[model samples]
Structures are given as C-alpha cells and as structure tokens.
Target: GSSGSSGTGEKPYECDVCRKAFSHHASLTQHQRVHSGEKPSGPSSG
Candidate 1:
C-alpha cells in the first residue's frame, strides 16, 4: 500500500494536541504554532 511514504508528496502532517491536518507546515504555517502553543492561529507571529 506504500503507506509510510507519499507519491505526489501529499501528507497528513497533523498535530497531536488538536489532531489537525496541515498537509505541510509551509502550506499551513498556522498550525506550526504547536511549536509553543502560545499563538496557534496568529498570522505574522514570531
């Protein structure tokens, strides 16, 4: 089934805290906030 890897590079990249699908952090960086959990939905955040 080739489940571990992707063909077209589509991924389910998700977070355990919210179990959200981001596909790729570069695509939906909003979920990258799981890094600190301080500002998950804040755009232009640092």
Candidate 2:
C-alpha cells in the first residue's frame, strides 16, 4: 500500500518513526533496535 506513495525512491524498509530516517536490508541485521531504552522478550530463552 505504501510502495508507490512516495513517487521517488522505493525505500524498502522504513521504521516510520523518524519520518526521514531509514535503513537497509543489511543494516537491519545488528541494528534496527526497537528502542535503546527498551528490550524485546523472546518467546523462548536459552
């Protein structure tokens, strides 16, 4: 739905928080955290 709305660059992935900020597929590996002050709890822990 949001693919052709921009009419310019087709930003693959957008966190939608910064409005202008974005990240690449590779950058989504180690980074792209939910938030620095918050953490996610996995379903199963080791």
Candidate 3:
C-alpha cells in the first residue's frame, strides 16, 4: 500500500455546487451554496 497523502497531487473534493470544481471539500461545500442560490451567510440570501 502506497498510502502517502490524498492532497499529494491534484484536486480532491469536486464542487457539487456549480460546474466549477475545487481541490478541497471545504471549498466545494462553501461553493455549493452559490449554485443552490443560498449565500453562506445572512438569513435572506438568494
């Protein structure tokens, strides 16, 4: 088993939010909101 690191190469988490993808899950998760028309903050967001 050559278990080195998941972040040792290319991207990891893909943005399920928009067609734009990311290398980290955090980025993807944060981005997904934009697609769903829900801002990361504020109660009344589009």
Clashing pairs in 1: none
Show the lowest summed lDDT stretch of 10 residues, model 2. 13-22
Model 1 residue 36 CA deviation (Å) reads 4.4
Which of the numbered candidates is closest to the native, going by highest lDDT? 3
- Predictions in order: lDDT: 0.58, 0.53, 0.64
Per-model TM-score, in order, reads 0.31, 0.30, 0.38
Off by over 4 Å in 1: 1-11, 27-30, 34-46
Residue-wise lDDT of candidate 2 within 1-46, one digit each (tens)?
A: 6565656554676544443434666664334455453456668656
Give the RMSD in angstroms, all C-alphas superposed, for model 2.
Answer: 6.4
Q: How displaced is residue 42 in candidate 2, in Å?
A: 4.3
Task: Choose the strongest candidate by TM-score.
Answer: 3
Give per-residue lDDT, candidate 2, residue 36. 59
Model 1 scores what on Cα lDDT?
Answer: 0.58
lDDT value, residue 3 of candidate 2: 64
Of the two candidates 1 and 3, the one with more favorable lDDT, higher being better, is 3
Clash pairs, model 2 backbone: none
- By lDDT, is 1 or 2 better? 1
